[PDB]
From Swiss-Prot, chain A:
Disruption phenotype: Displays partial loss of silencing in otr region as well as significant loss of silencing in mating-type and telomere. Decreases H3K9 methylation more than 50%, whereas histone acetylation at the pericentromeric region is significantly increased. Results in partial dissociation of swi6 from heterochromatin.
Listed Gene3D superfamilies: Histone, subunit A
Protein name: DNA polymerase epsilon subunit C
Function description: As accessory component of the DNA polymerase epsilon (DNA polymerase II) participates in chromosomal DNA replication. It is required during synthesis of the leading and lagging DNA strands at the replication fork and binds at/or near replication origins and moves along DNA with the replication fork. It has 3'-5' proofreading exonuclease activity that correct errors arising during DNA replication. It is also involved in DNA synthesis during DNA repair.
Species: Schizosaccharomyces pombe (strain 972 / ATCC 24843)
Swiss-Prot/TrEMBL GO biological process terms: CMG complex assembly; DNA replication-dependent chromatin assembly; DNA strand elongation involved in mitotic DNA replication; DNA-templated DNA replication; heterochromatin formation; mitotic DNA replication initiation
From Swiss-Prot, chain B:
Domain of life where this protein originates: Eukaryota
Lineage: Eukaryota, Fungi, Dikarya, Ascomycota, Taphrinomycotina
This protein's UniProt keywords: DNA replication, Nucleus
Assembly with partners or alone: DNA polymerase epsilon is a heterotetramer consisting of cdc20/Pol2, dpb2, dpb3, and dpb4. Heterodimer consisting dpb3 and dpb4. Interacts with the replication factor dpb3, cdc20, PCNA and rfc5; the replication licensing factors mcm3 and mcm4; the FACT complex subunits spt16 and pob3; the CHD1-type remodeler hrp3; the SWI/SNF chromatin remodeling complex subunits snf22, arp9, arp42, ssr1, ssr3, and ssr4; the histones H4 and H2B; the histone chaperones Nap1 and h; and the histone deacetylases sir2 and clr6. Interacts with dri1.
Full protein name: DNA polymerase epsilon subunit D
Range within the parent protein: 9 to 105 of 210
Organism: Schizosaccharomyces pombe (strain 972 / ATCC 24843)
Keyword S-adenosyl-L-methionine: no
Primary subcellular site in the record, as a coarse category: nucleus
Length: 92, 97
């Protein structure tokens, strides 16, 4: 175990940048996305996953469950404005 | 769905992000994790698109970090802004050294 409290290194993503860039590159309107931009888009994606998982978990906790099921994720997208952009994916 | 699967970010990295915000020993179902992996891909596209629009509106060809920060407001995730600014600050600090 570490001897002190946890210290985050900022300015890095835990995602593989090349993979994130591949998704970015699919956008037909973007001329070029800078590396700095790709890093921020990657970190926002990390934060997005954490947010989705948290809301899914809270739904599960309501029905006294310990884990996330597919329908927890679905019900989140069904009920929450912030996740409207996922409507097609989940066929709501 | 063939395209979503080819773009998908690694299952183990996404899983770690998911479990990082849940209590110890919480489980995450098969189709749930895949749901979130795919949602992540669309989020990349969603933020990228909104950022590209702001770049275009500024008659710029380069999508810049400030376009990403302003895109958060447009896609209504302004609660990510403080953290992204922190990463950006660190990025160009490290850069100049």
């Amino acid at each position: 175990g570490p001897l002190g409290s946890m210290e985050k290194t900022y300015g890095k993503t835990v995602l593989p940048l090349s993979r994130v860039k591949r998704i970015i590159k699919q956008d037909e309107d973007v001329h070029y996305c800078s590396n700095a931009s790709a890093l921020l888009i990657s970190v926002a994606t990390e934060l997005f996953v954490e947010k989705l998982a948290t809301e899914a978990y809270q739904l599960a906790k309501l029905q006294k469950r310990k884990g996330i099921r597919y329908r927890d994720v679905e019900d989140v997208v069904r009920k929450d404005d912030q996740f409207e952009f996922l409507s097609d994916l989940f066929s709501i | 769905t063939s395209e979503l699967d080819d773009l998908a970010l690694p299952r183990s990295i996404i899983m770690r992000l998911v479990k990082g915000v849940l209590p110890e020993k919480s489980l995450v179902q098969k189709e749930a994790l895949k749901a979130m992996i795919n949602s992540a891909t669309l989020f990349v596209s969603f933020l990228t698109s909104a950022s590209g629009e702001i770049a275009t509106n500024n008659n710029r060809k380069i999508l810049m970090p400030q376009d990403v920060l302003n895109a958060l407001d447009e896609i209504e995730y302004p609660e990510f802004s403080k953290t992204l600014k922190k990463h950006l600050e660190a990025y160009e600090l490290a850069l100049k050294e």
